[PDB]
Design an enzyme around this catalytic site. Structure first.
Site, mmCIF file in Angstrom:
data_model
loop_
_atom_site.group_PDB
_atom_site.id
_atom_site.type_symbol
_atom_site.label_atom_id
_atom_site.label_comp_id
_atom_site.label_asym_id
_atom_site.label_seq_id
_atom_site.Cartn_x
_atom_site.Cartn_y
_atom_site.Cartn_z
ATOM 1 N N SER A 1 11.560 -16.908 24.486
ATOM 2 C CA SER A 1 11.070 -15.609 24.238
ATOM 3 C C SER A 1 12.074 -14.946 23.045
ATOM 4 O O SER A 1 11.822 -13.998 22.765
ATOM 5 C CB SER A 1 11.146 -14.606 25.274
ATOM 6 N N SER B 1 8.709 -8.910 27.284
ATOM 7 C CA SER B 1 8.618 -10.445 27.136
ATOM 8 C C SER B 1 7.010 -10.897 27.217
ATOM 9 O O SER B 1 6.967 -11.864 27.621
ATOM 10 C CB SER B 1 9.507 -11.172 27.804
ATOM 11 N N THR C 1 15.866 -11.224 26.249
ATOM 12 C CA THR C 1 15.940 -12.317 26.969
ATOM 13 C C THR C 1 15.259 -13.362 26.752
ATOM 14 O O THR C 1 14.318 -13.079 25.795
ATOM 15 C CB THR C 1 15.777 -11.879 28.531
ATOM 16 N N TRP D 1 13.498 -17.085 28.968
ATOM 17 C CA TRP D 1 13.829 -18.380 29.879
ATOM 18 C C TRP D 1 12.467 -19.252 29.732
ATOM 19 O O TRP D 1 11.303 -18.806 29.854
ATOM 20 C CB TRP D 1 13.400 -17.680 31.140
HETATM 21 C C1 LIG Z 1 10.255 -15.946 27.413
HETATM 22 O O1 LIG Z 1 11.211 -16.407 27.276
HETATM 23 C C2 LIG Z 1 9.322 -16.117 28.604
HETATM 24 C C3 LIG Z 1 9.288 -14.693 29.324
HETATM 25 N N1 LIG Z 1 10.692 -14.076 29.044
HETATM 26 C C4 LIG Z 1 11.292 -13.719 30.299
HETATM 27 C C5 LIG Z 1 12.513 -13.124 30.172
HETATM 28 O O2 LIG Z 1 13.291 -13.731 29.461
HETATM 29 O O3 LIG Z 1 12.874 -12.177 31.135
HETATM 30 C C6 LIG Z 1 10.513 -13.897 31.269
HETATM 31 S S1 LIG Z 1 10.571 -13.104 32.800
HETATM 32 C C7 LIG Z 1 9.749 -11.300 32.444
HETATM 33 C C8 LIG Z 1 10.942 -10.534 32.368
HETATM 34 N N2 LIG Z 1 9.876 -9.152 32.487
HETATM 35 C C9 LIG Z 1 8.956 -9.561 33.733
HETATM 36 C C10 LIG Z 1 9.604 -9.091 35.124
HETATM 37 O O4 LIG Z 1 10.658 -9.236 35.069
HETATM 38 N N3 LIG Z 1 8.756 -8.813 35.947
HETATM 39 C C11 LIG Z 1 7.441 -8.027 35.360
HETATM 40 C C12 LIG Z 1 9.066 -8.535 37.295
HETATM 41 C C13 LIG Z 1 8.945 -10.969 33.389
HETATM 42 C C14 LIG Z 1 9.318 -14.801 30.957
HETATM 43 C C15 LIG Z 1 9.732 -16.337 31.434
HETATM 44 C C16 LIG Z 1 8.048 -16.665 28.517
HETATM 45 C C17 LIG Z 1 6.891 -15.720 28.927
HETATM 46 O O5 LIG Z 1 7.924 -17.053 27.310
#
Ligand SMILES: *C(=O)[C@@H]([C@@H]1NC(C(=O)O)=C(S[C@@H]2CN[C@H](C(=O)N(C)C)C2)[C@@H]1C)[C@@H](C)O
Length: 246
Positions: free
Chosen positions: A52, A99, A190, A192
């Site tokens: 991301s 994200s 961020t 992941w």
């Molecule tokens: C991108 O790298 C991926 C997304 N990016 C992230 C991240 O880096 O935080 C997540 S998790 C995302 C963060 N906000 C949401 C959350 O915490 N809740 C709704 C509880 C989820 C993904 C893995 C990928 C989607 O491309």
């Protein structure tokens, strides 16, 4: 008289990553000097999928080429998304903070494979290779980038020195504000990558100090599925405080 173990920020940030049983690096850049911290310094010059964090560059390209604008509301058209928090209409900036990859897949498809590949190569981001799948090239390869390349990229964004218009860079910067307090601002993105092995975690951004100085950072670590996502924020903030950047 006993001995005393004396530990400066180098040893402390190494041990922060050891305590999480994983491998990580924190790249810092300020005043055109880069320093490396963590328990796995060879990561700083190793290429990883950006996941991301690529949303920063997707946004710059889409705004520059007038495929979208900062007020456009991207509609949720009804498919079940990875998180209920993403099941709503939202702007590019809202999708950045969440994200929300389906919004940025819609934008990447508008940009299109040809323009996207040309723009990524013009910027020179990482290995500048996006392949033939316009909606996932930043998630499962072939695009890869090192943590040092990310810190150079985000430092240029912060300083309005990327080869994009000044308004477009200012607008993307505004999407990245994470926290403000006591005259400090933290900006960042961020990431992941959960769909490759080993998984990769990122937090790339910069601190603006009260006198205006910019200190850019790129945290890059191996993730595992049982970690809380906030592990990246925790490790970043403890390290920045040890370094007296905040
Ligand atoms: C991108 O790298 C991926 C997304 N990016 C992230 C991240 O880096 O935080 C997540 S998790 C995302 C963060 N906000 C949401 C959350 O915490 N809740 C709704 C509880 C989820 C993904 C893995 C990928 C989607 O491309």
């Amino acid at each position: 008289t006993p001995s005393q173990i004396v530990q400066g920020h180098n040893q402390v940030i190494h041990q922060y990553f050891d305590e999480k049983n994983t491998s990580g690096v924190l790249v810092i850049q300020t005043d055109k000097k880069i320093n490396l911290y963590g328990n796995a310094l060879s990561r700083a010059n190793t290429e990883y999928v950006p996941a991301s964090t690529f949303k920063m560059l997707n946004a710059l390209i889409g705004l520059e080429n007038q495929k979208t604008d900062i007020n456009e509301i991207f509609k949720w058209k009804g498919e079940k998304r990875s998180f209920t928090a993403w099941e709503k209409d939202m702007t590019l900036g809202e999708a950045m903070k969440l994200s929300a990859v389906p919004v940025y897949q819609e934008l990447a498809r508008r940009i299109g494979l040809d323009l996207m590949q040309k723009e990524v190569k013009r910027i020179g981001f990482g290995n500048a290779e996006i392949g033939q799948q316009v909606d996932n090239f930043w998630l499962v390869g072939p695009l890869k980038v090192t943590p040092i390349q990310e810190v150079e990229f985000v430092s240029q964004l912060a300083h309005t020195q990327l080869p994009f218009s000044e308004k477009v860079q200012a607008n993307v910067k505004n999407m990245l504000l994470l926290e403000e307090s006591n005259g400090y601002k933290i900006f960042g993105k961020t990431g992941w990558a959960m769909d490759i092995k080993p998984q990769v975690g990122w937090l790339t951004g910069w601190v603006e100090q009260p006198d205006g100085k910019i200190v850019a950072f790129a945290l890059n670590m191996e993730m595992r599925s049982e970690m809380p996502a906030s592990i990246r924020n925790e490790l970043l903030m403890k390290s920045l405080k040890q370094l007296n950047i905040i």
